[PDB]
Amino acid sequence: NPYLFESQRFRSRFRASHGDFRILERFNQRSQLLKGIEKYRVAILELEPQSFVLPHHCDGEAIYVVVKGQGVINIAEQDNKNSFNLQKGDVIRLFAGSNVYLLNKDNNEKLFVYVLAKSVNAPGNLQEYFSAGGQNPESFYRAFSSDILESAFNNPRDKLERLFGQHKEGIIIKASEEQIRAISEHASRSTQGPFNLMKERPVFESRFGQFFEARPERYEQLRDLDAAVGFMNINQGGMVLPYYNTKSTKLVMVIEGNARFEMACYQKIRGNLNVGDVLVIPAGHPITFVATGNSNLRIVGFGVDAENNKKNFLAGKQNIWRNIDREAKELSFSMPGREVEEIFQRQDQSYFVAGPE
Ligand SMILES: O=C(O)c1ccccc1O
């Protein structure tokens, strides 16, 4: 499967000492049929307890989704400052060129952030510009002549030289309570910000699973990217009835449990998905997920071209076939209509059912 990007294809970019930040492969290079998502790049940013990513800004519109833990983020713009703290499931939209720094304010729990970002300069070409740092990573402030910086900051080429250079530790370093308590107090708000993935009722739900989806049609933050952050919660031993998306290519990744998937291309692409593995579900392709293991099945994913995207189910009480009449069913499968109608209808459940034990 060219759609299957295992967790091992996440390329850790910078020398990150405490935790690390990993960029997944370009979707188009592995097999040039994933070119609708060629401008899109997915990443996974990982923060150990009491860590801290140096303030930077990416060229490209981003979307942070918190998968594990909690922490504090700070978005800095030319004439605007905002400090939010996030829990599990919180989605927040990062705009291009905006400066950002994170921190794991938890002393035992770890910080996992599932990240989406679309290019703006060259299709897929994504770069992080670090205003902080020293030698690791370089600070773009060291790409300017000393007399330029000396004339910009009004400072001799000594204090600036010792400032932007004297810094050894990587992107993610350790923070301390005297720093955190102040940082988290800037974040402490009263009475755009983040929104949890369960801010809504499940778009679809059964006694065996739930599906939450943040949509551009509701959340303004998502209208620019035309992206939807759906979250699919399958219960132990359960499954999603085979369905397909109308126009949205999804970039889905397992965050809890082991998922067994099958999908039509019609080549039958099958596989197993562990936590951290990425699967791409292009638009129109049917697919099903099954919880395989003692654990549950929680699995999150971004969706591009999200506006007006529906889900059409191919089985269950509410599938597309009820909206196809009897005679068309006869011509379709070359059997009596009341006979195939009694095949499609003897599943009383609609979206999530019991997977094969
Ligand atoms: O197929 C989807 O639309 C989807 C969206 C978000 C998470 C998991 C998913 O399968």
Name the closest-CA residue to atom 2, ligand 1: 250
DSSP 288: E
Query: What dotted CATH number matches 1-189?
Result: 2.60.120.10
How many Å lie between the centroid of ligand 1 and the Cα of residue 287? 10
Pocket test for ligand 1, best of 116, 212, 252, 314 (most atoms within 8 A of CB): 252
Query: What dotted CATH number matches 190-357?
Result: 2.60.120.10
The torsion angle over the Cα atoms of residues 8, 9, 13 and 18, rounded to 10 degrees, is -20
How many residues can be counted in the chain?
A: 357
Helix ranges, 75-155 (H): 146-152
What are the Cα distances from residue 39, in Å, to 7, 27, 117, 179, 252? 20, 9, 8, 37, 17
Q: Give resolution in angstroms.
A: 3.3
Which of these, 117, 130, 98, 136, lies nearest to 60 by C-alpha position? 117
Question: Which is the closest atom of ligand 1 to the Cα of 303?
Answer: 5
How many Å lie between the centroid of ligand 1 and the Cα of residue 356? 21
Name the closest-CA residue to atom 6, ligand 1: 230
Domain boundaries, the chain: 1-189, 190-357
Q: CA 218, 220, 224, 227 torsion: positive or negative?
A: negative
Burial class of 116 by CB neighbour count within 10 A (0 to 12, 13 to 18, 19+): buried
Question: Which is the closest atom of ligand 1 to the Cα of 248?
Answer: 3
How many Å lie between the centroid of ligand 1 and the Cα of residue 140? 38
* Residue list, ligand 1 pocket, CB within 6 Å: 230-232, 245, 250, 252, 281, 299-301, 303
How many Å lie between the centroid of ligand 1 and the Cα of residue 218? 17
For 264, residues 6+ apart whose C-beta sits below 8 A from its C-beta are 285, 286, 287
Pocket test for ligand 1, best of 281, 285, 304 (most atoms within 8 A of CB): 281
The rounded distance, in Å, linking the Cα atoms of 138 and 129 is 9
The rounded distance, in Å, linking the Cα atoms of 161 and 140 is 13
Q: If DSSP codes are grouped into helix, strand and coil, which group holds residue 76?
A: strand
How many Å lie between the centroid of ligand 1 and the Cα of residue 180? 35
Q: Are 306 and 218 in contact (CB under 8 A)?
A: no
How many Å lie between the centroid of ligand 1 and the Cα of residue 320? 18
Q: Are 333 and 355 in contact (CB under 8 A)?
A: no
Same fold, 1-189 and 190-357: yes
Token output for 187: 């974040």
Token output for 51: 């860590």
